[PDB]
Amino acid sequence: PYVRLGYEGILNGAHDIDVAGLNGVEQLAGKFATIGANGVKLAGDNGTNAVGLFREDLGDMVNASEKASFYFRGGEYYVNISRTSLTAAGIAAGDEITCDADGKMIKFTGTGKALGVVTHVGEYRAGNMYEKATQGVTDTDTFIGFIMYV
Amino acid sequence: PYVRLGYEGILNGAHDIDVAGLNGVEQLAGKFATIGANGVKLAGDNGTNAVGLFREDLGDMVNASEKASFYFRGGEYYVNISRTSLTAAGIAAGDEITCDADGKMIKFTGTGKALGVVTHVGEYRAGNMYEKATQGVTDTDTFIGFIMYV
Amino acid sequence: PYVRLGYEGILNGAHDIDVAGLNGVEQLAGKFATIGANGVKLAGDNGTNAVGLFREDLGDMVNASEKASFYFRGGEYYVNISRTSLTAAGIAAGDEITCDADGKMIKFTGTGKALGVVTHVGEYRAGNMYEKATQGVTDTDTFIGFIMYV
Amino acid sequence: PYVRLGYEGILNGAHDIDVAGLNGVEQLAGKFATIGANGVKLAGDNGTNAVGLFREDLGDMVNASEKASFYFRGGEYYVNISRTSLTAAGIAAGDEITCDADGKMIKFTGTGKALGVVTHVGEYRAGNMYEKATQGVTDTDTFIGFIMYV
Amino acid sequence: ALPVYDKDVDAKAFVISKRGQVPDQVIEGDRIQVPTFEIVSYPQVRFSQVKERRFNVIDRAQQRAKADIMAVEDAEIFSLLEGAATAVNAVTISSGGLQRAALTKAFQEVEKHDLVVTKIVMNASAFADIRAWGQNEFDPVTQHEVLQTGLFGHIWTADILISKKVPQNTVYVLADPEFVGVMPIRQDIQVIPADKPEELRLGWVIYEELGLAVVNSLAIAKIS
Amino acid sequence: HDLVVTKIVMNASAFADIRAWGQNEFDPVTQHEVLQTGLFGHIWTADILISKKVPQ
Known about the structure:
This is part of a larger assembly, with four copies of chain A and two copies of chain E.
Chain A: E1 31-33, E2 54-56, E3 61-64, E4 79-81, E5 96-100, E6 106-108, E7 146-148
Parallel strand pairs in A: 1-3
Antiparallel strand pairs in A: 1-5, 2-3, 4-5, 6-7
Chain E: E1 25-33, H1 35-41, H2 44-65, H3 77-80, H4 95-109, E2 115-119, H5 120-128, E3 148-149, E4 152-157, E5 164-168, H6 170-173, E6 174-175, E7 178-187, H7 191-195, E8 199-207, E9 210-211, E10 220-221
Parallel strand pairs in E: 2-4
Antiparallel strand pairs in E: 1-8, 2-5, 3-4, 5-10, 6-9, 7-8
Helix pairs in contact in E: 4-5
PDB class: virus
Keywords: phage G, major capsid protein, icosahedral, gp26, gp27, virus
Entry title: Phage G gp27 major capsid proteins and gp26 decoration proteins
């Protein structure tokens, strides 16, 4: 396990990694970190963990988050959760990582306040109301893509 | 008891982790599964129930249904764990919920007693000759209620 | 990379215990298993294999389907039984097949677990070198020869 | 050509004369084939389009039934079972063949796995036992070129 | 979806479907003819044409009733039907009494019915019935009817799986998309014409057949 | 009371029972009926349960 405590970087930094409720167990997925399907190589690897904002390009890989899309489910709003049955890996030297989504840290620039929700605008703002996993409520922003704690 | 060997003061779910200590694969200390902190909707319930159809949030983050209908998608039928609230006997403020694969214990309500899958009419049910099949790890015991897993 | 391979991948192998819950359910009956499939059939012709992406196509036909280097978000929640198979891949051609579903442990026997691209459904090959996309819901990077849950 | 020396039915004819059969240089029938053209073929080939049931011409030669949808051969049941039948350049049509009346193969197209008779103008139809000739109960494969006879 | 007045929570149920694919198929049937035979015989060309046409419509019927969807198949009546309920059957003295009994069951459900699609043996035998010493018990008491009874049609079709009757209403259950309609084509240079002085008559059609749902179509099998 | 309110199962088994003297038991006829007893209509309710008939 390794969990970064940062807030400079946008592919590095976390302060909320796992987040509150009762019942709703069932169903499993995992997926690769960084960019895959590279060469005609066959082997995977392991490395060092990075927890930041991630986005699916559709399918089972999550990678560098430049924007958010979707108003539905996990979106393009994926974060890396460390486990003890993994070596844990982020950007660079990816491995099969379990993810999470929703009620984690988000990124502001001074545009919008509150609720880490799946939306079609990168700098994450409210527009779907109530919980969905999310219990976070931010009322404060910082310039330049910096990572705020819910 | 309140914690360990049961959970009490809960209205959605009941006793779980009666094996004592964690054993789940790819688990750390888990993450909120939500319907009593308010999920995204729950499908079914033909009587008093709070077992529905549940969905992956695209990873190991699990919640109640976030996708309509009842079509093919990956994952294993978890043993359903429900941890105690840190309110008196209400719901919400529930503890990060580790998803056991084969722990103890949930009610059984399909064809067989070690088999059963989750369906859109609520509870657990046997399969269909068109889609899905029955094969679970429902455990011992039986109890049909808004309280359940005893 | 990604063509089918024989080697006790194609045709079912020798008898492991790969079923948690009771073995055999006659659910899904009336879907037939194809003769032969995508890629190179090596050491027998089988349309269906245990562990993988499977699809109904052509109505009341079921077959094998390749899940590539990514995708298995919309996997399957029914699997084609893994009794009689050494590596949890291969299941006999012909007739209305006996299915199971998920909720059960399987065994893969070989090198690497839950890393790299598939070289054949139900297989995961690695060296701990090179970043190659992972897909499926599989467990545990830590321990090779591990009993991994679909 | 002198090719087709030694006991060949598998490279002799354009289609199999027999693949599990045998006959020597023993004439139990010195009759010619007036079925399968030479003069645009090898003299190891006969060019036979049927080796099954035959009917006699004027003179002492046997050939295939060239019968319509309202014509049919009566008796004169022979099946061709020659390998080389008393030649030194490999049997060709117009040279000696040894026939039997219980030999093999019996050509059939149909959809196979059923009795067949010969009416060969490109027209194949099945057997019966009071309508068309009594083959005795046998399974004769689909599409002429490879026929395993029971 | 019971209210919170039986203290129940409303159902948020979402209806489910499974999907079927049908690729285009060809149904066809041939007649093979000799020119000489057709000239000397005299009506034969007219007759051969009526015969090729009737043969293709028959092979069409065969397919539509009996066969399980393979890959070279469309949607077939015998697959779509609902399974037999033995409960609907009871102690009888006639084949006709069972047949009346199947038909009525469908109405209870609020299925659609319009026609009886029955086994050739079963329909006939049902008409033929006795009271143990004669008198049909599904047709009048001095008259025989084999056309329509109950004010619905009867179809007797061979190949549909022994001793089964199906109420359904054809218009709802299936629909036939026709890529190209029926046509005869004739070729004197084809596989069979070359060998022997013959003409080949081909009569074909390209179809697809769609089977909506499993409902509004019920099959019942006879008493134990 | 001018109609019979039955279970779907009971009615169908009830209808299927033909005498050994070859008369239908609901109405004494050798024709198709839409289901009539007492010259009265049948209303099929599946809350009524098996072996039960309720006229009303």
